[PDB]
From Swiss-Prot, chain B:
Residues 17-87 form a coiled coil. In naive mice, specifically expressed on type I interferon-producing cells (at protein level). One of its GO terms (biological process) is negative regulation of intracellular transport of viral material. Keywords: Cell membrane, Coiled coil, Cytoplasm, Disulfide bond, Endosome, Glycoprotein, Golgi apparatus, GPI-anchor, Immunity, Innate immunity, Lipoprotein, Membrane, Signal-anchor, Transmembrane, Transmembrane helix. The extracellular coiled coil domain forms an extended 170 A long semi-flexible rod-like structure important for virion retention at the cell surface and prevention of virus spreading. Glycans are attached at residues 13, 37, 40. Induction: By viral or other interferon-inducing stimulation in most cell types (at protein level). Down-regulated by ebola virus GP protein. Parallel homodimer; disulfide-linked. May form homotetramers under reducing conditions. Isoform 1 and isoform 2 form homodimers and also heterodimers with each other. Dimerization is essential for its antiviral activity. Interacts (via cytoplasmic domain) with ARHGAP44. Interacts with MMP14 (via C-terminal cytoplasmic tail). Interacts with LILRA4/ILT7. Interacts with RNF115. GO terms for cellular component: apical plasma membrane; cell surface; Golgi apparatus; late endosome; membrane raft; plasma membrane; side of membrane. The lineage of its organism: Eukaryota, Metazoa, Chordata, Craniata, Vertebrata. This is Bone marrow stromal antigen 2. GO terms for molecular function: metalloendopeptidase inhibitor activity. IFN-induced antiviral host restriction factor which efficiently blocks the release of diverse mammalian enveloped viruses by directly tethering nascent virions to the membranes of infected cells. Acts as a direct physical tether, holding virions to the cell membrane and linking virions to each other. The tethered virions can be internalized by endocytosis and subsequently degraded or they can remain on the cell surface. In either case, their spread as cell-free virions is restricted. Residues 1-87 are extracellular.
Length: 95, 87
């Protein structure tokens, strides 16, 4: 009889009911994932900020190392010059 | 019956709309998870680059201190030798 109809209507009502709950739960999971992505992005920006500072600082240090190397070379040459002056202090032309 | 045929066609249209919304939301969910996973990789990449740059800055600071010590040393040697000469 119309028993078949009542059963079909119940099935459809149950299915829509279930789908609504699944939809709400999936949307909630979506928003949770988006919340995680947002937080992660701030972490990325913070790391990028710190890396920029360190990259600049490393370059500054390399310039300073170069400056100091040049000074050590200069002072070593001055010491070497004094040693050579002593080495040659008795050297004359004899021919 | 007809009381059921109408109620059924409607409930069918609603089922389909909800199934469509669910699919869309699931797909957006997967995309958001991928954004989070990609971001996680970027974090690891940056953490490792930052660790190397921090370590480089430490090595370079050690070198700077060594060189500064050498400069002071040589400067004093030169001053002692210069005072000694013709005093």
């Amino acid at each position: 009889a119309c028993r078949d109809g009542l059963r079909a209507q119940a099935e459809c009502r149950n299915t829509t009911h279930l789908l609504q709950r699944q939809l709400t739960r999936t949307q909630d999971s979506l928003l949770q994932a988006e919340t995680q992505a947002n937080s992660c992005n701030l972490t990325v920006v913070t790391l990028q900020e710190s890396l920029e500072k360190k990259v600049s600082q490393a370059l500054e240090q390399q310039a300073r190392i170069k400056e100091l190397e040049n000074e050590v070379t200069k002072l070593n040459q001055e010491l070497e010059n004094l040693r050579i002056q002593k080495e040659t202090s008795s050297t004359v032309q004899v021919n």
